[PDB]
Each structure stands twice: as structure tokens, then as C-alpha cells.
């Protein structure tokens, strides 16, 4: 049974970056050339691994981390980067091993009058740990006074909506991003390229 990569890439709807959905791939022969053959996946940045050699290595599990972000914030998705998404939504470790695959999705994700179904976290006490998810929608405290978990001055909802519109610039159009996160821990692997 072949692996579901193309199901992840062509999923009809992607998850919000703050609640970044994770799909786990295991016990399958993962052909990476075929996804690399789909050049319309414009961004193919890879770190801590050789993208070509993925077809030769084995891994215990591969996580298909899928979400949507603005085009300009795509730069924040990389090792050692900082900013809105890299801190409060999806922090990649500075020693990250894997690949990020991002492509413009304005043709489908963007809607007239904005697409607000995609949301991102921007307020938090500290940086997210690598691969940390935080769905907590509680009112974030930004001052001395506790504000009873109800929105008001100096205490805000930590999530904001992108509102993607079709006509925005390339740097601000939605970019569907799927991030391959790898695993190998003291046991025989399950996923192998060859």
C-alpha cells in the first residue's frame, strides 16, 4: 500500500497554523522523487538532510505538518528564524532535519472579502518550543490585572485571522505549507525510501 503524500498535498482544506494539523506516515515506501517531480511545489527548502537521498534512508515515522501562512512569512519557516509564526505558531528547531514544501494557494484558498478560516497565534508568554502546538484560546494577559478570561484592554485574544484575499501581493497571498518532520529513535525504522 502506497503512502498518502499526495492526499496531504491535495487535501481540499488545510489547517490553521496555530492549530497546525499533523498527519503521521508510517510503515510505507515513501518515494520522494515523485513529489520533487511536481515542480509546481515552488518552495522545496530542506534542512538537516539531503533531499535527493531521502529515497535511500529509512525513518521510524514521518509527520506531514500541514498549514497555511502568508507568502512573506514563508521565510520565517526555517531553522534559526524568528518572528510571528516562528515564535507563536510553528517553531522549527535550529537543528531541524526535514523539508518544508510551500506553494502559492491564492487560486483556491483566497476568497473575495477575505478568507478568515485560517488563524495564527501572535501573543504568548514565551517562544513555542520546537514542534509545539498551542490551541489554548484563553484571553492572553498583557498587563498586571487579571481580566477574568474575557477580552478587554491589556488582555487580548492571542489568535488572529489572515483574511486572505485573491488580489493581494505575492508576499501576502496564502501559501499552503506542508512540513515533513522525521523520526529515528533507538528502534528499527518503518518508512524507507527504497
Amino acid at each position, epitope marked *: 500500500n502506497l503512502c498518502p503524500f499526495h492526499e496531504v498535498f491535495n487535501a481540499t482544506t488545510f489547517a490553521s497554523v496555530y492549530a497546525w494539523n499533523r498527519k503521521r506516515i508510517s510503515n510505507c515506501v515513501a518515494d520522494y522523487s515523485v513529489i520533487y517531480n511536481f515542480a509546481p511545489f515552488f518552495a522545496f527548502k530542506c534542512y538537516g538532510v539531503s533531499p535527493t537521498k531521502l529515497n535511500d534512508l529509512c525513518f521510524t515515522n514521518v509527520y506531514a505538518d500541514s498549514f497555511v501562512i502568508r507568502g512573506n512569512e514563508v521565510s520565517q519557516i526555517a531553522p534559526g528564524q524568528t*518572528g510571528n509564526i516562528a*515564535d507563536y505558531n510553528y517553531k522549527l528547531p535550529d537543528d531541524f532535519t526535514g523539508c518544508v514544501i510551500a506553494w502559492n494557494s491564492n487560486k483556491l484558498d483566497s476568497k473575495p472579502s477575505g478568507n478568515y478560516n485560517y488563524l495564527y497565534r501572535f501573543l*504568548r508568554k514565551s517562544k513555542l518550543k520546537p514542534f509545539e502546538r498551542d490551541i489554548s484560546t484563553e484571553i492572553y494577559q498583557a*498587563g498586571n490585572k487579571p481580566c477574568n478570561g474575557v477580552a478587554g484592554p491589556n488582555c487580548y485574544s492571542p489568535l488572529q485571522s489572515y483574511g486572505f484575499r485573491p488580489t*493581494y501581493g505575492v508576499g*501576502h497571498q496564502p501559501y499552503r505549507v506542508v512540513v515533513l518532520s522525521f523520526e529515528l529513535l533507538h528502534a528499527p525504522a518503518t518508512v524507507c525510501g527504497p
Partner: antibody, heavy 115, light 108 residues
Framework: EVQVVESGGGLIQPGGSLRLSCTAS????????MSWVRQAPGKGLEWLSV???????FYTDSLKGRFTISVDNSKNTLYLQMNRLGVEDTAIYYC?????????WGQGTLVTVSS | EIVLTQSPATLSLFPGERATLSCRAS??????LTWYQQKPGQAPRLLIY???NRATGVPARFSGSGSETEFTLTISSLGPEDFAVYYC??????????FGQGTKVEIK
């Protein structure tokens, strides 16, 4: 209005260094987006630097390598270390908290780089 | 680098007149643009965020419009306090961004 007060601005010789200070009464500086913006006399505003709640900070290319931004969690202050100040740096430097629905500026402190 | 050309340099309206302030961007930045009010000798004050949304405490007379490369601040009626400088700042990397040269609201 939430009040933030700047301090530490004054006369300085060319080529010197300076540290501006900014304090917050109501809000917590460590838990907010804080930026420094200067307004040279009779000239437009120029955003200098920002520090995020998580400690991430950014600078303009015109100021990279000269200005540095830092915070104090216990005292609840924001600091801007300035190095190699020229005459053109003469400006009122503001401390501002930026939020999607709010922007709380202080009242600025003058920096005079002159002989 | 994104450069914003505010116009007119000076907007000499009589009090109570509607004030329209143009701010044009050299790049398509979407609606990520912010407008700041600034009384003389005082720190700026946020009016509009994302070019359309009025900030808290700002009177309803203020309103924003335009997108992408042509943005316009609209004051339905200039009050005496409204006679001040106004800056447009892009927010492509919020809260970062460059400012416009500003527009002065004074008649004589």
C-alpha cells in the same frame, strides 16, 4: 490611557553612545510588542527596532550594527542601547506598545548629538 | 524597500470639512497599512489598522479605505483637535514598516 514613560535622553557628543529607558505602569513590557521610533526635527518618522514578547527583536538596515534593544522583566522597563551616534541621529525617540487594536506611545525623549 | 508617497503635503481645510488623505504604496501590500495621528510636540496616535479598522477610542469620524497600492484616510468632519499631522505606515511585517512623509492639516 495606558502610560509609558521614556527617560535618559540628553546632550551627547558626536561618536558617543547612549542608553534610553522606557517604563510601563499598567502593562507588562515583557508581555507585549515594544518598538522604538525616532522623529528627527522637521522630518518624518522612522521605525527603529521592535522587541517581541518572546524576546525576538528586529532592526532597520539603516540602523543595524548601531542600535540594540533590550528589556528588564523585574523592573518592567525597555532599553535601547545606542552606539556611534552621529549628528543625524538627533531626534525625539519614542517608546511605543503596538497591538492590533491599540498603539500606546509614550511622550518621547530628546537626543541631541552636537558639540 | 517599500516607499509610501503621501499627498497632499498640506491639506488646508476649514474646520468641519471632510478631509481625505491619499497614501500610495510602491508595492502591493494588501490592506496591511496603518495610519497615525500626531499632535505637535506629542507622540503619534493610532487611527486605523489594516487600513479599514478603527482603533479603540478613535472617534467614529475617522475611517480608512483602499487596498494594495492606493490607500485613503477619511475624516468625516475635521474637529479643532483633528488639525494635526497624519502618517501612513505599511504593515507588511507588522509592527514593522516604513512611514510616509506625512500630511499637515492647517489652513493659516
Amino acid at each position: 490611557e495606558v502610560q509609558v514613560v521614556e527617560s535618559g535622553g540628553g546632550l551627547i557628543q558626536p561618536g558617543g553612545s547612549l542608553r534610553l529607558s522606557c517604563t510601563a505602569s499598567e502593562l507588562i513590557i515583557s508581555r507585549n510588542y515594544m518598538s522604538w521610533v525616532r522623529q528627527a526635527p522637521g522630518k518624518g518618522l522612522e521605525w527603529l527596532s521592535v522587541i517581541y514578547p518572546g524576546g525576538s527583536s528586529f532592526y532597520t538596515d539603516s540602523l543595524k550594527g548601531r542600535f540594540t534593544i533590550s528589556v528588564d522583566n523585574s523592573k518592567n522597563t525597555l532599553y535601547l542601547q545606542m552606539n556611534r551616534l552621529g549628528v543625524e541621529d538627533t531626534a525625539i525617540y519614542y517608546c511605543v506598545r503596538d497591538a492590533p487594536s491599540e498603539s500606546d506611545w509614550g511622550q518621547g525623549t530628546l537626543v541631541t548629538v552636537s558639540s | 524597500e517599500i516607499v509610501l508617497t503621501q499627498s497632499p503635503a498640506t491639506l488646508s481645510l476649514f474646520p468641519g470639512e471632510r478631509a481625505t488623505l491619499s497614501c500610495r504604496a510602491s508595492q502591493n501590500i494588501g490592506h496591511f497599512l496603518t495610519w497615525y495621528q500626531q499632535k505637535p510636540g506629542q507622540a503619534p496616535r493610532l487611527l486605523i489598522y489594516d487600513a479599514s479598522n478603527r482603533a479603540t477610542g478613535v472617534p467614529a469620524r475617522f475611517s480608512g479605505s483602499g487596498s494594495e497600492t492606493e490607500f485613503t484616510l477619511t475624516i468625516s468632519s475635521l474637529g479643532p483637535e483633528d488639525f494635526a499631522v497624519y502618517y501612513c505606515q505599511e504593515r507588511s511585517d507588522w509592527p514593522r514598516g516604513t512611514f510616509g512623509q506625512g500630511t499637515k492639516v492647517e489652513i493659516k
